Amino acid sequence: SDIHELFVPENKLDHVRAEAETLPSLSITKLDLQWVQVLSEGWATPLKGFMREKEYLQVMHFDTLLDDGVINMSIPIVLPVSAEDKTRLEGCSKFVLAHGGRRVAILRDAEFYEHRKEERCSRVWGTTCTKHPHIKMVMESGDWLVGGDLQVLEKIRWNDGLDQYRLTPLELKQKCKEMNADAVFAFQLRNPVHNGHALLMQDTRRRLLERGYKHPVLLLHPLGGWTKDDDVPLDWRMKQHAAVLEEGVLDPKSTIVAIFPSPMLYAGPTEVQWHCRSRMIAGANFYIVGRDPAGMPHPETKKDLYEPTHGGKVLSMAPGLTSVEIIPFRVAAYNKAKKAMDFYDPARHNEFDFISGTRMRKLAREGENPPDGFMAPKAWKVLTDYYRSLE
Amino acid sequence: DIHELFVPENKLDHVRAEAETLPSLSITKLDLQWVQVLSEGWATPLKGFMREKEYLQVMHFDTLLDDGVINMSIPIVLPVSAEDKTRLEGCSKFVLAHGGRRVAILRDAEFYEHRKEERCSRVWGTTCTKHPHIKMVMESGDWLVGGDLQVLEKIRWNDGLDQYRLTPLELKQKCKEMNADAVFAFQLRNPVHNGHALLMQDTRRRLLERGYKHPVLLLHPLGGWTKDDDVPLDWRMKQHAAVLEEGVLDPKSTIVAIFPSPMLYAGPTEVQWHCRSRMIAGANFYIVGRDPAGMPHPETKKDLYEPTHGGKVLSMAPGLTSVEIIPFRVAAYNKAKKAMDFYDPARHNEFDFISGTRMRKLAREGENPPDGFMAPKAWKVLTDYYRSLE
Numbered sequence: 001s002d003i004h005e006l007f008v009p010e011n012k013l014d015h016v017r018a019e020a021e022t023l024p025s026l027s028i029t030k031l032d033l034q035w036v037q038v039l040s041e042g043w044a045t046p047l048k049g050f051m052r053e054k055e056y057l058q059v060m061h062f063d064t065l066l067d068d069g070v071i072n073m074s075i076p077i078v079l080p081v082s083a084e085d086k087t088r089l090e091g092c093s094k095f096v097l098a099h100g101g102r103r104v105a106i107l108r109d110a111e112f113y114e115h116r117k118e119e120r121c122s123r124v125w126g127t128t129c130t131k132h133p134h135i136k137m138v139m140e141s142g143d144w145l146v147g148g149d150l151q152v153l154e155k156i157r158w159n160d161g162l163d164q165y166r167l168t169p170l171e172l173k174q175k176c177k178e179m180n181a182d183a184v185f186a187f188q189l190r191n192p193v194h195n196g197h198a199l200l201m202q203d204t205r206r207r208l209l210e211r212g213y214k215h216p217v218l219l220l221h222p223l224g225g226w227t228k229d230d231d232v233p234l235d236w237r238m239k240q241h242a243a244v245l246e247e248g249v250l251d252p253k254s255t256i257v258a259i260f261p262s263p264m265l266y267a268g269p270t271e272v273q274w275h276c277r278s279r280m281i282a283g284a285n286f287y288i289v290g291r292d293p294a295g296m297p298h299p300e301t302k303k304d305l306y307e308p309t310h311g312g313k314v315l316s317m318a319p320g321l322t323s324v325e326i327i328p329f330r331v332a333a334y335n336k337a338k339k340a341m342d343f344y345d346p347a348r349h350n351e352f353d354f355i356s357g358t359r360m361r362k363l364a365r366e367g368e369n370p371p372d373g374f375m376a377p378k379a380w381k382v383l384t385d386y387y388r389s390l391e
Numbered sequence: 392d393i394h395e396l397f398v399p400e401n402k403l404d405h406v407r408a409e410a411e412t413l414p415s416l417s418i419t420k421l422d423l424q425w426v427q428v429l430s431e432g433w434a435t436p437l438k439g440f441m442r443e444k445e446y447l448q449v450m451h452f453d454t455l456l457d458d459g460v461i462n463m464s465i466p467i468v469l470p471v472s473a474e475d476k477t478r479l480e481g482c483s484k485f486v487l488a489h490g491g492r493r494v495a496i497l498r499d500a501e502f503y504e505h506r507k508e509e510r511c512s513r514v515w516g517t518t519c520t521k522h523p524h525i526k527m528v529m530e531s532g533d534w535l536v537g538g539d540l541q542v543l544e545k546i547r548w549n550d551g552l553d554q555y556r557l558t559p560l561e562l563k564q565k566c567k568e569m570n571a572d573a574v575f576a577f578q579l580r581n582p583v584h585n586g587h588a589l590l591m592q593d594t595r596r597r598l599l600e601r602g603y604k605h606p607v608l609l610l611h612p613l614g615g616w617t618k619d620d621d622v623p624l625d626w627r628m629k630q631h632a633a634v635l636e637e638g639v640l641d642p643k644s645t646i647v648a649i650f651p652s653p654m655l656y657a658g659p660t661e662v663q664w665h666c667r668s669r670m671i672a673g674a675n676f677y678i679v680g681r682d683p684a685g686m687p688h689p690e691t692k693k694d695l696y697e698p699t700h701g702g703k704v705l706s707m708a709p710g711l712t713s714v715e716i717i718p719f720r721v722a723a724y725n726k727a728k729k730a731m732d733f734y735d736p737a738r739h740n741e742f743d744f745i746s747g748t749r750m751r752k753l754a755r756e757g758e759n760p761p762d763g764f765m766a767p768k769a770w771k772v773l774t775d776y777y778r779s780l781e
């Protein structure tokens with residue numbers, strides 16, 4: 001299957017930069033720039049750039065782009081612009097996008113359309129609650145959206161010591177080919193890997209071997225774009241994942257660790273389709289989904305913002321995902337008798353303790369060990385080190 | 392095909408008997424209008440009130456998926472109080488009752504959470520509780536129940552308008568009787584002015600010029616729940632009758648019928664439902680204009696929806712392959728022509744826009760609208776209506 005990168009070809013790049021120095025310019029945020037990276041590398045194939053109004057409408061109402069054939073696309077990738085910049089750029093079909101003093105892309109054949117923020121947040125998140133940190137960022141953005149074709153001058157790098165893990169979809173396909181994979185199964189995650197997560201990955205590996213695949217390769221794919229203020233930062237999460245692999249909870253020989261560049265929306269069953277389709281583009285034939293994917297507590301009511309079973313049900317159902325098989329799972333929890341993470345069975349409610357992020361964070365803050373079997377000790381050590389660094 | 396949910400007349404006595412002995416759930420008038428919608432096949436291929444899986448398909452994809460892709464963009468669900476859910480959750484089957492009467496049996500029932508904020512957000516693109524239908528959803532029970540619906544008999548209202556409440560199959564039969572070779576539908580909730588008439592007349596003209604010999608207009612006023620300040624159904628039926636009597640629309644090539652669905656006022660989401668239901672009734676052409684199924688935002692008083700979105704969305708919506716969308720832009724009063732005409736931007740100063748507000752003013756003042764805006768006998772029906780409000 002095809003991957004549509006948006007980079008300027010290597011020969012024409014001197015010419016294109018020269019052109020870019022002469023164009024009107026538009027400042028974009030760090031969030032916008034992460035979306036530029038997403039688009040540039042082909043994760044949103046077949047988009048040619050930021051969404052035009054027609055593509056936006058298709059995504060909002062149908063969770064699929066339609067024009068080149070039905071392919072899943074459930075979140076808008078759009079560029080908000082202030083009314084002042086919109087007026088400034090009237091009649092300008094092409095202009096450069098800039099961040100941090102650097103020109104990063106040319107946007108051609110621009111189309112401005114009204115940023116209807118309430119409707120956008122309602123349809124994407126199922127709420128307009130301003131305490132939701134990503135919704136908060138949408139509401140504070142400009143009153144216009146600009147769609148158009150994007151020519152990205154070069155790969156977006158962040159010079160944080162992690163660029164070597166920011167593999168493109170083409171690079172992930174090539175790496176899987178070099179490992180002689182006959183099945184690629186992806187695990188999206190935003191959190192540290194505990195042994196419930198590992199249980200999902202090892203059970204998926206087991207089932208792929210039983211089907212007759214000989215070299216299934218795990219794509220352990222932590223998300224690395226914007227995340228909310230309280231979460232464990234990307235660099236610490238990468239150290240924690242490396243510790244899980246060093247402990248052998250996951251096998252480094254059959255695993256690729258890479259960073260998925262998308263911002264996190266925390267939009268549950270809407271977002272999990274984007275997490276899946278982007279991995280599909282990168283060549284994953286199988287996609288793991290568990291309970292409450294891409295969810296968070298409602299900031300007002302503190303209840304689950306989404307029904308925790310909806311992500312898997314929707315994803316197993318979703319159109320435009322024909323080259324990836326969904327592997328859904330139910331809740332993993334701590335089995336007290338086995339001293340191991342296990343699949344929860346209501347029929348045996350008394351045998352399990354559910355994993356509370358709040359309680360686990362309290363343990364890590366105080367340096368207390370979790371129950372035996374919850375997380376590999378060197379990875380837990382990464383987390384207690386992290387919380388000590390904040391004092 | 393059409394999937395009606397009625398008990399076969401040969402098995403009715405058995406089923407009625409069973410219904411007499413089952414636990415019972417009292418439903419609202421709005422619920423009963425949804426029972427009518429379901430029972431007659433407007434939401435084919437649904438077997439009843441939506442189960443959670445169908446609800447999720449509709450909210451996220453605007454299509455039902457299991458028997459092939461077919462457009463379905465609004466939930467048709469039955470809300471249930473926490474108390475009634477606790478009372479019935481140990482029951483696989485029970486009766487739906489309204490006004491002391493047993494109207495249906497719900498079989499293989501499944502209760503799931505009514506997550507109201509998410510439902511209203513995804514269907515309407517807002518949770519504004521001043522929106523009157525959203526208000527009704529917010530005040531309903533905390534559970535939804537889905538299941539297979541067995542409807543004992545046709546839902547009749549016995550108000551003197553049941554003769555217009557045709558089922559999809561009855562609409563196909565009438566079109567057969569009229570020897571139609573094309574059926575084009577006009578959904579509406581408002582009185583017919585000559586802009587609406589222009590959309591229908593222009594559609595007829597274009598079908599004639601494409602070689603259709605007997606195009607039949609389905610003038611299909613919605614007749615389920617509507618908001619308080621709309622013109623009531625009975626007045627609208629008299630107003631439409633007067634439009635046909637004046638010849639503005641031709642009665643010999645027109646079917647006037649009442650579409651039983653409640654009105655959501657959910658704009659581009661709802662217009663797909665207005666379209667797919669007419670597709671089920673055999674319309675192969677569907678007219679859509681500006682701001683279909685829209686309303687002013689109750690809070691900000693702007694348009695709740697972008698007025699071009701309904702036609703743009705409908706024109707590319709999936710699961711509508713057996714109906715051709717015919718979109719139109721704004722029709723407004725051309726002063727120089729003294730007639731309704733398609734609006735022209737370069738030409739802006741020649742167009743007069745006559746809102747319901749200015750019609751209220753015109754009737755209050757004992758005045759008529761400019762010549763050409765509405766057929767005189769139909770405007771007269773409206774002045775009777777406004778007068779009846781004292």
Ligand SMILES: Nc1ncnc2c1ncn2[C@@H]1O[C@H](COP(=O)(O)OS(=O)(=O)O)[C@@H](O)[C@H]1O
Pocket residue numbers: 188189190191196197200288289290291292293294295329330331332333355
């Ligand atoms: N205890 C659990 N049991 C089952 N699945 C889980 C559990 N915790 C997390 N998951 C799943 O594990 C994957 C990653 O979870 P997170 O990193 O927390 O968040 S997510 O945003 O990436 O989804 C998702 O598929 C999610 O549903």
Ligand SMILES: Nc1ncnc2c1ncn2[C@@H]1O[C@H](COP(=O)(O)OS(=O)(=O)O)[C@@H](O)[C@H]1O
Pocket residue numbers: 578579580581586587590678679680681682683684685719720721722723
């Ligand atoms: N002035 C107008 N010009 C063009 N289309 C119109 C106009 N007014 C209404 N419409 C369209 O006429 C049809 C019926 O409109 P209404 O009865 O007002 O409301 S609706 O809810 O049924 O859509 C819809 O297709 C709507 O878009």
Ligand SMILES: OC[C@H]1O[C@@H](O)[C@H](O)[C@@H](O)[C@@H]1O
Pocket residue numbers: 223224225226227228229231232233234235
């Ligand atoms: O997920 C990548 C990064 O996004 C940032 O906005 C968050 O503040 C960090 O905690 C996180 O590492």
Ligand SMILES: OC[C@H]1O[C@@H](O)[C@H](O)[C@@H](O)[C@@H]1O
Pocket residue numbers: 613614615616617618619621622623624625
């Ligand atoms: O549309 C049918 C009826 O619905 C009711 O809710 C409204 O109050 C009536 O005015 C309307 O005629």
Ligand SMILES: [K+]
Pocket residue numbers: 081082083084141142143144
């Ligand atoms: K602005």
Ligand SMILES: [K+]
Pocket residue numbers: 471472473474531532533534
């Ligand atoms: K309740």
